[PDB]
Structures are given as C-alpha cells and as structure tokens.
Design a protein around this ligand. Structure first.
Ligand SMILES: [Cu+2]
Ligand SMILES: [Cu+2]
Ligand SMILES: [Cu+2]
Ligand SMILES: [Cu+2]
Ligand SMILES: [Cu+2]
Ligand SMILES: [Cu+2]
Lengths: 464, 464
C-alpha cells in the first residue's frame, strides 16, 4: 500500500534531467507525484540533451525553488546508438535557469546566451548557494557564475601539449597541461563560446569511454590537446575548488579568492599525491607530467571537507582518497587510502558518481559497466576506507543523491538511452533497495532540492 | 519495500505517450522499471506531440511487442499555455509503428509517410489484432490500416453542411453530414494528407471546445464544415465499427465487411436512438439532422459487444447507453439507459475516457475538469447503469486501462502539460486508489500490452 511506502521518505523533491528525453522533471518523494516537468524542444531548443544540474537552497522547495540545467548539442546526438537520420543537429550547449513556482517550471533565462559560454558537462552550486560552476570536456573550459547577476566570475581554458604527439601515446607518455584565465572577446563582456564553438573534439568522451580518444575513435581538430575537463567540485569549508581533468587523471585545486590554481592532485595509485603548479605568465600556469598512468573521472569532497575522492578508471578502477584536513594549505593534502577490490581488476566496472552520508560515515559509489552487465551501488565505509557491500541495480547507473536527514539514497539508471531506466531508493540503515520507481529518462544527473546551505554539503556542490 | 506492492499488480506492461514531452515509454508494473522509451525529437521529428496509441496481442510482451503511436503538430503546440516563442512549429501528424524487442524500442516505420495519411487523434487496434484505425478531428478523416503490410484498407472524409451558416448556430440548427470514401491521388497509391494538409481547423477541439469553435475562438479555413471526428471504436464481436463525430454528437456505425456507413447513433438524451444513412453516389452517403442538441465525445463497447456508450458533453453531461445485442442489425440498436448525476449539471465534469471490467459488470469513466478542480474517476454499475462512486485523483485526468485479470485500473493524469502528473492505480474490489507512480508525461492515452485478442476487448480497441 503505497501511501505508507512514500510516507517514510519525508518531504523531499527529486529533480532529474532526461538526457536524450529532452526533459527536466521534479518528483515529490513523499507522494510519488511528479510536481512538474519541462520539455526543452517545446521552447525551440531543437537538440535539448539535458545533461547536468544543480539546485539552490530554498526555505520551502514545495512552494518554490530554482536550479540550473545545461545541455550538450552537435554530434552528441549521434553517440548513443539511436539510429537517427538527423543531418544537422541543433548546436546546443545551453545553460538554463529554471524556477519552480509551486505549480509549474518557468524557463527564466539562458545563461549561456547571456554570457557567451556554452558549457555542457557538470553543473555545481557553490557552498553558499549563490553561484554555480559549469565545466566542459570537449572545450576544456570551466567558469564560476554569479546567480543573481547571471555573470561570469572567472573562466579558464586548460590545454594538453603531449610529450609524444602520437595519439595512442599522447597521454601515457605525459605532457604539459597549460591553464589560462580567459577574458571575454565579444563586446558587452561576452565570451565567444556559444554552441559548438571551442570544441577540440566533436562529441563528449562517453561514460566509460575515456580512452576512445587515444584509440582514434573520436573526431576533432585538436584531439591530442584534450584534457576532458569534467567538474569543478567545492570544498564545503569554502575557499577551494577542484577541477577534474579526466585524461591526465588530475584534480587541479583553485583558490576561489584570487582565482589561481594552487596544486594539482594526481589520481593514479602509486603516483605522487600532487604536482606543483608553476606560474609562467600573468594569466597562465603549467603542470608537467612525465607520464599518465590511468584516466580518472568522478570527484568529490566529504561533507566536513577533510577527505577528497577521485575515481581512477579503466587502467585502474579504484577510489583514491586524500587527507584534505589542512584547510589552510592544499599542498599539504596527501593520499591516505585507496579503495580497491579484486572484482574491479578488469576494464569495468568503473567506480563512478558518489554521495556521502551527512555524518560522513559512509560514501555510496556507483559501479558503471557497458551493457549487459547489471550496474550497481558500492557502499564504502568512509572511516576505514573499505568496501562494505555491492548491490546490483540495473543498466547504466549514474548519479546518487541522499535525503538530507541521511535516511535514503536515491539514484538513477538510464538504460544507455535505449533500455531499462529507473529511480532507485536505498535505505541507509539496512543498505538494501527499498524500491524502484519508473522513470522516462536517460539522466546523467539527479539532485534533491536543498533547504539549507548545509544540505549542499551532500548535494551537487561537493561531489559529482 | 515496494517489491510487495508491484508483485500484486502482476506481469503487465503499461505504455504511455508523452504529449508535450515528445516520448513514448513502457513500464513494467511488476517491478516498477521502465523497460524502454523513445524521444520523437531524437529522430528529426521537430514537433513530436505524442498523442494516441494502441498495442497488438503478443504471446510474451516481455520478450517483444508492437504498437502504433501517432503525433499532432502545427498549432496544437500553442494551445496548452506553454510560453514558447516558436514561430513555425513542425507539421506533425506522424503515425509510427514501434516494436519493443525485449531490450529497447525500434522505430519501425512512419506509416503516415508511407501511406500519405497524416491523422492525429485516436488510434485503435482491430479486434483480431491485425489492423488499426486512426481518426482525426481537424481533417475529419479516418482510416483503417493493415498492420502487416502497413497499408490503407479504407479511408473516409466526413463533412458538415450546416442549415445555418452563422458559426454560432452551425451545429445547433442542424445540417447534413456527408461521408466520402477516399481514393489515393498520388503515385504509388499514396494519399495527399501528410502534415497539416486537409485541416479544416488549426488545432484539435479541447474539452468543451465545441463552444469555443461556435464562439469564433478557433482559427481555420473551414470552421463551419468541421464534425471533429474522434475515434473509430470496434464492436468486439466483429463486423462493425463506430466513428464518433463530436460536434454533431453522432456515432456513425460502419460495416467493415463492405466499408459502408449503415446507421448514425444520436447521442443526446431525448433524441432518437439513431438516424438513417442514405447512399447518394458510389462513394458518398448523407445523414440529415434537423438540430444538434449537445456535443458528445467518448465512445465504446462493453466487452461482450451488447452495450454501446456515448458520453454527451457540454450541453448535457451524461453517459448514453444503447442496447446493441442485435449483432445482425445496427439499425435496431436502441437507447436503453442514461447515467446522470446532480453533480454533472454544470459545464464540467466531462465524462470522457472509459474502461470496462473483463466481466462487463463495471465501467470506470474519467471525470475531466479545467484547472484547478481536482479531476477523478467515476465508477459506474454497468448492469443497472447507476453511478456508484467518484474518486478524486489529480489535475487533468486522461485515460484508463485495466489489467487483464481485471484486478487493477491504471490511469494517467497529465497536469495540463505543466503541473502535476502521474500514473494512478485503483483496486477494482475496493474501488480505492492503491497509489501513484511518478510520470514525466502529458499522456492523453495509455494501454497495457495485450497477450490475446480477448484482452483487446478491454483495451484500446472497444473504447477510447
Ligand atoms: Cu562527470
Ligand atoms: Cu553519470
Ligand atoms: Cu553525462
Ligand atoms: Cu477522444
Ligand atoms: Cu484524454
Ligand atoms: Cu490530446
């Protein structure tokens, strides 16, 4: 009897982007009703690949809330096996502000249009809930934005110059990563990165697909210069952000106060904790890497700020953990644990998206595989850094959120945009699935609308 | 754990079109997983208002099944209060054959492109599961199609010549309804009715729309000639179909054996059971009406074929019942009962989608209202023809299906394409809602995949 079922979850609203569905929706977990949804194409967005999102604190989400959801475009339509005859896909890379008003969603604005930065990968809210970052893995640009004035606080380009320009070897044998503070180049303080402009490669490196670039499977004009920026995740204590770069397996720490990169964490087990960042011009820094052992993808801080996690993938499948307890000095942050399992020894599964419990005692980590292996959730003890349980969910598992009273993990799986998809709920006490709800969605994201800034510590702010 | 909850629904697959979401999806009600979905826009359908659908018998739906789903287009995008700036929307009126193969959907063909008939209103499967009809109330055309060969069996235009050419009086004061058997006009045996071609009005009439048409609130080139065809529903005993025409409030019975109209049933309480059809040329019939007392919309046979129902709307809100137990002679079909309620005295609710229990003992009927009145489900005794109970569900209630063991009615509500939406499940023993599943959809339809031709008797075949 279902009232009893939902009544246990509490008054929390799940938001999900639909990827190839083109939708965003909000669902009330306390009743199982969908409160509202919006279809990008209704508005003239002809390629609404609704990708990542974050929501800002609201005193009463059921009366109103805001979020940012972005899109990808161009040939991103062509990489998930849908046999479409579309010849010229919409450019995409939109960044939309959407407000729920208690009845419906309202499309407030297109921040990519206003600012000129079209960025299609992770969206993250800043810890005070008053700005957000968006990163892009085809352009290798990220920016932090002020929500009130819809403007750019900072924007950076990250470039790779490979030691070996052979595409198979362009990362393995190392390189120089250059970080450049960008300045607007169009009148009105606008950037020139609308739609597909700035792309080094012609579609994103897909879930699990970091190496397709080196293997010669991705077209583009600047293939060996890619780093595949993914996310800028936030230290919940403030001041610092971590920019994940998937191909070199590096999280670059930035000082948000002066907007400079300070240190570069190196993912791979058996490599150093970090490499220095050297300033080479007023607006340009470099990191030198002799080699890249493995790519890395998902990244995040623990709620208290004292641990940072980076998921090595493909060449190694592990969770790398740094002690980040020294808030004053990121060059003191040192690897302190690595979560490994014999069953992660192949190419897959990849340790993937994460969410921590509010008390910081456990981290849930998705386990991604290509079809047809069931994808699932790893439950990790975040005090001793040991894997506790793996639970199978279904195909193409993506993000996890958690109810902010810490009782229930809520995840989405997304069927590779063509098979089974769902919203899964896991009880954090028993670490068992309490159920599956249907979901028309290929979501690579999901969030529970936060009420407070403290909620963001366990939302799309600290972690992907 | 919802496990227990879904186990009781049994192994049934629910299909739903998205309306303004642009998707179709199948949900396994035994597990809560969405088996597969498809997004019209991915395929270059720029205005995929996914509208009506029917599914065919499959001996194991979990291993595979097929269905037809159609779309609307043109200005139908502009009538649900979505503040879109789109100036020239996609033409639409597609008719897609979709096959689930056990893992995903395959968009098999575009039967509208293949045949040239673009029809955007109800889709209904024939009782043998080998064909399907599609009607359209902007064009006033319907056709029955052979599924195997994806070809037209028959197609008809219905036209209104009003007694009074004043648009406000064009139906009230009666007229002559002309039925024409159509012939292809293009090479290849194609029709010339793709996209918006053949439209007499520029959108489908909304609930209560007949007054908005009379009042001059709907644009179009042939406003006084519209009958607003809705559906061709099937006698489960075979041989006959009923074509509903909303504005005259008539269901025209056709002999599927020779493809000729045989009698016209008249909806309104206090009018004759029916009027004669006269053949006036090889391919043309007429029905004469001295007056039209009220419009009517939803229409359907009981599972045994012995009752036909037609929902008077707007000027009367009732369920008109005919004794249709004479299978040999529709001209003998006579009004036997009318379901009325003091609460039906206003403009709304409109009685408008239905589903019968397998044993024929009850019929569930949706109660539609404009926002913000809660919409709901009426439960009618289909032996004594009395209203038993009304239950409130949500905003914008649409269709009802029933699991084929007769245990659960499954309905969808759709938030006027902007607010709350969901799938509701009602236990047919207590006639109480057992609960609500989230649903990103503005669905005007839903069906449960049939196993047998007997299942179609309670599916999108005998009723809308
Ligand atoms: Cu990512
Ligand atoms: Cu993901
Ligand atoms: Cu993604
Ligand atoms: Cu209808
Ligand atoms: Cu409906
Ligand atoms: Cu509709």
């Amino acid at each position: 009897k279902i009232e009893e079922f939902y009544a246990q979850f509490g008054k929390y609203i799940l938001l999900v982007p639909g990827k190839f569905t083109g939708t965003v929706a909000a669902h009330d977990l306390s009743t199982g009703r969908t409160l509202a949804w919006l279809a990008g194409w209704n508005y003239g967005d002809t390629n609404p690949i609704m990708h990542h999102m974050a929501a800002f604190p609201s005193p009463d989400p059921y009366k109103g809330f805001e979020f940012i959801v972005n899109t990808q475009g161009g040939k991103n339509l062509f990489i998930y096996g849908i046999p479409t005859t579309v010849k010229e896909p919409g450019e995409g890379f939109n960044i939309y502000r959407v407000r729920y008003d208690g009845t419906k969603f309202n499309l407030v604005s297109n921040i990519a249009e206003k600012t000129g930065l079209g960025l299609g990968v992770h969206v993250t809210a800043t810890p005070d809930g008053k700005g957000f970052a968006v990163a892009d893995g085809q352009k290798d640009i990220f920016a932090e934005f002020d929500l009130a004035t819809e403007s750019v606080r900072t924007a950076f380009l990250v470039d790779w110059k490979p030691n070996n320009s052979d595409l198979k070897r362009a990362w393995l044998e190392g390189g120089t990563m250059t970080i450049t503070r960008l300045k607007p180049t169009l009148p009105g303080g606008k950037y020139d990165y609308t739609g597909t402009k700035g792309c080094k490669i012609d579609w994103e490196l897909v879930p699990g697909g970091e190496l397709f670039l080196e293997e010669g499977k991705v077209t583009g004009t600047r293939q060996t210069n890619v780093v595949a920026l993914d996310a800028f995740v936030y230290d919940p204590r403030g001041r610092w952000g971590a920019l994940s770069a998937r191909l070199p397996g590096v999280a670059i720490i930035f000082d948000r106060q002066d907007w400079e990169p300070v240190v570069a964490l190196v993912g791979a087990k058996g490599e150093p904790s970090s490499l220095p960042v050297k300033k080479v011009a007023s607006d340009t820094w470099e990191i030198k890497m002799d080699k890249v052992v493995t790519p890395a993808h998902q990244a995040g801080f623990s709620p208290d700020g004292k641990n940072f996690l980076f998921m090595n993938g493909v060449r190694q499948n592990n969770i790398m953990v740094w002690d980040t307890s020294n808030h004053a000095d990121p060059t003191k942050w040192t690897k302190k644990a690595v979560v490994e399992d014999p069953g992660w020894r192949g190419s897959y599964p990849n340790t993937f998206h994460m969410v921590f419990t509010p008390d910081g005692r456990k981290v849930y980590v998705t386990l991604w595989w290509p079809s047809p292996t069931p994808n699932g959730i790893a439950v990790v003890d975040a005090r001793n850094w040991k894997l506790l349980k793996s639970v199978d969910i279904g195909p193409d598992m993506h993000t996890l959120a958690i109810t902010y009273d810490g009782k229930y993990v809520v995840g989405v799986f997304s069927g590779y945009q063509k098979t089974a998809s769902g919203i899964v709920i896991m009880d954090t006490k028993s670490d068992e699935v309490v159920g599956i709800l249907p979901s028309v969605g290929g979501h690579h994201d999901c969030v529970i609308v936060p009420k407070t800034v403290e909620d963001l510590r366990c939302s799309r702010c600290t972690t992907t």
